[PDB]
Design a protein around this ligand. Sequence first.
Ligand SMILES: *[B]([O])([O])[C]([C][C]([C])[C])[N]C(=O)[C]([C]C1=[C][C]=[C][C]=[C]1)[N]C(=O)C1=[C]N=[C][C]=N1
Ligand SMILES: [Mg+2]
Ligand SMILES: [Mg+2]
Ligand SMILES: [Mg+2]
Lengths: 231, 222, 235, 244, 233, 204, 212, 240, 195
Amino acid sequence: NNYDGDTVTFSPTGRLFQVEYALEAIKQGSVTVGLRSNTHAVLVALKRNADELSSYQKKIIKCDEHMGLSLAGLAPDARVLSNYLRQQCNYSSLVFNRKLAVERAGHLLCDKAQKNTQSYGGRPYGVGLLIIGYDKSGAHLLEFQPSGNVTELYGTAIGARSQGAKTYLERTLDTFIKIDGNPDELIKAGVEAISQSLRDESLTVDNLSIAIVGKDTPFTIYDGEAVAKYI
Amino acid sequence: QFNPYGDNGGTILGIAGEDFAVLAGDTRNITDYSINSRYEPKVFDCGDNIVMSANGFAADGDALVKRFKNSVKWYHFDHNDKKLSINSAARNIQHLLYGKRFFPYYVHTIIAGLDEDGKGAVYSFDPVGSYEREQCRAGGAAASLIMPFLDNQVNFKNQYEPGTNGKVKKPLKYLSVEEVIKLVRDSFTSATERHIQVGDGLEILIVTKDGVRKEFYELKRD
Amino acid sequence: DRGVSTFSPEGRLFQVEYSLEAIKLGSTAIGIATKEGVVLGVEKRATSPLLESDSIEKIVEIDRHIGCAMSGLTADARSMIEHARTAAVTHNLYYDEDINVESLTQSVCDLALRFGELMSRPFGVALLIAGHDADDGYQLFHAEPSGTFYRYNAKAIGSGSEGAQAELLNEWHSSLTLKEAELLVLKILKQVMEEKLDENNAQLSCITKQDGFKIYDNEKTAELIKELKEKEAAE
Amino acid sequence: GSRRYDSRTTIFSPEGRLYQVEYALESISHAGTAIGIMASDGIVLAAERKVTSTLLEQDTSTEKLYKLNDKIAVAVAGLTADAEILINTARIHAQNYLKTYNEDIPVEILVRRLSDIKQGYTQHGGLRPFGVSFIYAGYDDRYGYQLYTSNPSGNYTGWKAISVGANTSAAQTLLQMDYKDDMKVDDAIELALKTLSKTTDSSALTYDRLEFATIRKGANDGEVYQKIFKPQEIKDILVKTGIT
Amino acid sequence: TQQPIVTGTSVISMKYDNGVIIAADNLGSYGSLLRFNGVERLIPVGDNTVVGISGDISDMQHIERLLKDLVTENAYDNPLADAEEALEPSYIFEYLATVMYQRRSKMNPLWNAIIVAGVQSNGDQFLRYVNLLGVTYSSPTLATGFGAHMANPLLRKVVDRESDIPKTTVQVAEEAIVNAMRVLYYRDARSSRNFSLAIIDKNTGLTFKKNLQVENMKWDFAKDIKGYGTQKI
Amino acid sequence: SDPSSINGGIVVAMTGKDCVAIACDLRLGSQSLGVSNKFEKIFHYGHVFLGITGLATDVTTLNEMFRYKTNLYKLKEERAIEPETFTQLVSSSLYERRFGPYFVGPVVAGINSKSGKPFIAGFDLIGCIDEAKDFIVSGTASDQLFGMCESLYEPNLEPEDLFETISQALLNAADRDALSGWGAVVYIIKKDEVVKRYLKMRQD
Amino acid sequence: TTTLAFRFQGGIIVAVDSRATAGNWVASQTVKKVIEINPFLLGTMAGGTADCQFWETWLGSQCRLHELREKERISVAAASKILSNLVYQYKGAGLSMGTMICGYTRKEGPTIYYVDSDGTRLKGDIFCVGSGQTFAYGVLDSNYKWDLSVEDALYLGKRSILAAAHRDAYSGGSVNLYHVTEDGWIYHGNHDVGELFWKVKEEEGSFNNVIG
Amino acid sequence: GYDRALSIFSPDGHIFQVEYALEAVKRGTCAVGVKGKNCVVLGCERRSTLKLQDTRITPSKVSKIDSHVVLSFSGLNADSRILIEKARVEAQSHRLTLEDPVTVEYLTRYVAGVQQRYTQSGGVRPFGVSTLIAGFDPRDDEPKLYQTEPSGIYSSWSAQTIGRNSKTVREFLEKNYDRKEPPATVEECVKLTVRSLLEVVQTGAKNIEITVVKPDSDIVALSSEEINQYVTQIEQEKQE
Amino acid sequence: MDIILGIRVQDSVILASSKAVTRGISVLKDSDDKTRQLSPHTLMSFAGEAGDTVQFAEYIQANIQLYSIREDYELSPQAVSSFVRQELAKSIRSRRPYQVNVLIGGYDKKKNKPELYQIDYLGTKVELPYGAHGYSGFYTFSLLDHHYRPDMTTEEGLDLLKLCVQELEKRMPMDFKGVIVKIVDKDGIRQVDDF
Ligand SMILES: *[B]([O])([O])[C]([C][C]([C])[C])[N]C(=O)[C]([C]C1=[C][C]=[C][C]=[C]1)[N]C(=O)C1=[C]N=[C][C]=N1
Ligand SMILES: [Mg+2]
Ligand SMILES: [Mg+2]
Ligand SMILES: [Mg+2]
């Protein structure tokens, strides 16, 4: 109200409204789902078009051979943050000959986003990210919020109507975690999860975006006729 | 006074075929009159069907290869996983080298692969980034021993057709991958005999449309 | 007052949303992508008859294989064009090749959100970037001051955009010829323009693989306008 | 953050006026009147000190008339402290020019430089403008005797006769009435003092409430002399012209 | 640009079937003066890596502090710091190699020759060299300074190529290393009798041996040597 | 190569009874080549006189610099600078270039307008003040000038006698120096009159 | 290196050799010592290979940006000055360049500028540059006329490089010919000196000193 | 440094600081530009509220940027000096690097670019100035006349006016200027320029300035008497 | 470059400058004009290190032309020479100094007098009746010292200049390929096309 003019101002109840408004931009964004087993981690994203002449906005970005994310909210902010992850993954490899741990990647994103919430002049990031990866401790899935909060999960969803997919994953938890050594079934579970968030529209060939990383599987993105198999 | 440069010896050789390319190099690494390693790989697969070797001062050689491999990675990120063509890689390497014009990478760089028409390609660089596409190029310690032999046996220089006595040249017939590998092995065997910094092992990377294959051969260890 | 980089309660940047309103006041620009080329057309909209209309430059070359049309605060576009041209030429210098149309567009869009308290405000102009490359063929992009860019089969920006876009919705198909696209841009420009369309208050351009980017002569466009009038009178 | 307290000194009003420049001009309209009159054989500078005291040491006092170099002088109207900042800059500029070209700085070039400095404070930096208006009296071998004025906007203009500070409207009308082109310095001296005597807010015009200066080629042969009048000399010229 | 002041001589090492061995004497020389007699030049990092350093001792102590800080930093926000995300020999080496080459590129080198010996997570032997120029190389045997000229020839008789590594036991390897240290004591004028030896095995882990001495020395034949040619008495 | 002896030249100053004298040669050269016979090395700022020997570009630069500074001084102080005060200003200005100095040998001469006391001073290239009672010398023939002054000089000379002494000191010193001569000027300075005299001398 | 360029009735002839050396070692006989800045502009290459390659390729980028911005062909004067001003910034650092910038515009006609790494920029009719420049000058100065046919002008340039290739040890390999008209340059082939020498000797009657 | 964003968008998509800069131009004295077949004429209004002015030394309204290009303006006088100085520096820089004087279009594009930059840079306000830039390209006999404004947009004009009551004189020019046949001589072009100012000026005395620019760096400013003869002839034809 | 001469006569200043440009072993050009017009009545000739000479001359030219446009006024030769001297005096303590020597010949329209200024790369300025840079003075000053009278005509100045050039062509080892001669007077600057 009087305390939402900038990010440097607490409200009387201890809230940061600019951060909360940035969180609101994610809710307007298109739905994206993340889930993993012990061998693989999968991203599924519903891409959004402007109209029938336009292309469908890409949702998934590769960060390294073993890591990548999906976005919901301001796409340019995802480009900035993914670029930062690319550099950090790259610094780890060049200097230490070491693939960056997914947990450490989450810590770096948290700290970068935090600086934008405590200083004058700047603004919070207006995007939410779902990071998947396979490192020395197996498969991982992270959820990033531009408040700075990063959380490691078995499965989750962000964006508009993401609550439907999140409940489904909460039911299916015991099933999909056991899908080891079977990429197609893990993606099926993700495609079925994101379907719980659809209304009026359904998953078409240029609508659906899928990404997977695993034990002997580099981070690869599937679009177009490559996802027709799962429709 | 501190000398930031050193000489790790070694010798490399690139030959472009009709639908293939080879980049070879000995595996010996030295300083002065000592052997550091009998097997230290010098020719690297950099992705996108491109092989590279930066021969001379090994620290600069490793740094350059490392920065080029990195440039391939970022080329994919920035341009929608587009394949970096050999001519584009060559121009990129010129800028990496010329960036340190006034404190140069003390190396002789050679890359090999296939051009956009599928034909064999070899590019050669000096330490400060001047480059040129070539059919044949040796680099490093025994380059002066090897190049004349390749002028004669690959390009048929000073060879004419019997009976004509200098009137008709020997026609420039194309060489198979098996033929090129024979010339590479004989080049390094001969270089090993007469050059003290050449020996131990020979590693050849062969590039075709199918990908990058490796071959290793023993060289004399004295 | 309030920060320049402030979020609204709906999760939108105030300044970006306000710059979009300035673009709605701009003159109309239309782009249509075909398999034979991409056509770019603009409304010149001279404020007075004494203004020499051929000095109005709202269609611009970025490289031989990339053209660009603008709508909104057109003075803001000049530094964007300069950056685009520099990016296109610089990439050719570094890589001995043409730059991808998407990569060029992405480079332009990276400037967009570089504002705060860098430049003091967002750009008040939208761009239609059209071009060709070997990998993805003929392409048309819509670059906004939000930093977002969409690829389009056909797109209209400016004051007559929503009326034009609805018309482009019906008319575009994947088998359009270059000639059919030219007439289609002229037809829709004529529909949404205040003044009567002629060769002096409207401008056409195209990008083909063979000839590259070309701005059309007033004599060439005048013939296409006459061809349009006759085919509309034909039924 | 800090934005909250920013007055924004360099913005246009809806009418296209610079707020701070307009308000600075309002400040200057309460300063003591300064008058410049250009004649064929010299220039006169006359200025009124603001409501003084009997305990003020006049002979060592200077609030109106300042020397920029041997050829150029200024009359000040506004904040004296602001004026001294600019005056010292102008003195340096004159010396920079003299060092560079080995010639005395032409009057206009000095005036343009100071006016450009004033202009800058109205367009960038977020600082308040200088609350000062100058009358420049000077001589060079190109244009001869010259009068200029500058104000907080950084705009400057040339004059035959001009006033700044308080009651300029009344003063300018009186100057416009009695000024003629073939006028001489001694006549201009009389006009300046008569104009101040009529426009003054004080009861009577006396020597202790005035600063006076002349720039004359009344220097032995082809050269120019600046004369900052002493208190006794102002008293004498007041008697000569018949004001006291 | 500087000059080394207090220096350490050879570091020697070799691979064997189940791991690596590394050794270095305990001397800190000050030119020809054998100044400091209790200097440890093998520095363990965790339980899987030993970094052996020769050359300038002030720069060695600086590197020692970098490695100590590296362990601290790796533990930060790392629940698997003592397991899957522990420091590997390859990570430690690449870090040092980066620092060495950066410092030489600023014309202000760390005046050292370094050998990183260790065993990786998958049991693989790690042995690699780096020096003040940023030059790096790997071999079944590695040695610095005088060791390169005298130790390598002896160690290469045990492991001459890669295929000799599985045929070489820890007893044979240690025997060869200890003999090489004796030879260096005979022939290097900047060496000492006292040395440290470290074994990193994939089964038995890190064994760090301090206060070892060169023994079984041959000197008796010296009594028969008289004059420099013609002298008989 | 030596910057202080590329162009050549000399300056000498002397005190007398209620007067001072400062003199200089007129030569400017490029080593062996004589370039100008009208290069005066003495300047004045009000009643304070400054002679400068050494590298000619720095002679010109410093003159322009001290004109600059003494003009600002006068505008602010509302009086002409005095010899004692100017001497400190020269010293301060030279020392600010301690590690990139002007290659010059300045000499100050004048009479204090309030006390009437004659004043002379010399400097090295970085500011050190030599405040002699009798005389100051500078330039490529400074050794010669020291010899002339030390024998010819006597205290309390009248203005017209001092003229003869300083003139003969300059002339005979210059004639034993390859890089000095080609004319000469002598300033005789009294409290409110200064006479300038050009001397006839050999032109080789 | 021997490079030359000269103005005549038919435009400009550019001729260069092909040899590159590291000491006495012949590093290459196939060097492209002419750079195609655009269809209208050529640059010659002498001194350091890299310096010349890099900065004349860069020059083509600046020329392209000029004509994108100004909707007009860049003048030879303006193009040459961009390069000379650039190398002047680097003066002292150790760049090694001797180049001819050659073009043909409406306003200028055929124009050649000699540009140099010490900052020298000279307009002229005939320039020769490189270790073998003196040898080539001899043939040019005695045979040059304005009223030369494109055919004869091309041969003179070829013959002048050959003269230098024969005598100068750091020149040789092959000859690259270019002809610059107002609609652009035109390549006139690679000519091996090993074959060209015996051909010219036989046909021309020259080099009687050499046995064949 | 002072970094405050003064020029920003409003909810309706307007940048008020740029629009208020145009209001300063509206207040400024009237300036007019007319191009003939072989010339361009720049006319300027002088407000007669200021007499006792010294016209020898007072800053003239038309400024030479180079020997072949001139610049006039309407709006803040102090602001115009900054643009004129930058333009003059750029003109000499162009001659130095390109070895050719600026085209009129190039010089206009530069001045317009400076004006635009001041509309999205922190800590600065826009220029309260619109300019008329006129001249002839080197070795060209085609007349050139361009206009710029605070926003940074620019364009070419057959004839144009800026400043106070410019709406009235533009009305006059739009009905009196024929494109198929522009003022064929200097006389006709000056006459049409003086006529256009007489719609707005008041007295035709010292209130009208005229500057004629012809090809090949031929620039001259008309005197009071020369202009007065045009003023006399115009009204004598009007009495009919 | 090599030889630059200057002579100030009754009503004009005459500058003579060699035409040769030599890069080491070859004479690349024999028609080089080593001069720049700074203003309609001011000419500057120059000689020194390659590149620096032209770069400095054109930089000075640009600055004087800028002044002329700003003030609508031509600076006096004295003022221009002082500006040039200061630039060189600034340059001599720079990271890389301008290695350039100049003569400035101008006609002062106010005083109706020709003026010749000699300035070296250190910033050493002198006004002279005649001057030179490098070894040129070494030959010519004796002839000029003899024959020069301050009231010579332009034609007499050219004849005395021919005698100077003839002496140079006799005794100088280097072939400087003749001189380009230019005259600066009340009507401006013109080139003598036959010398
Ligand atoms: B030419 O002789 O100048 C030649 C042309 C070069 C620009 C392609 N230069 C060289 O051959 C130089 C050496 C040299 C010889 C004679 C005069 C000047 C210079 N060689 C190189 O620059 C070189 C050598 N080896 C590899 C790469 N570059
Ligand atoms: Mg060998
Ligand atoms: Mg003599
Ligand atoms: Mg040869």
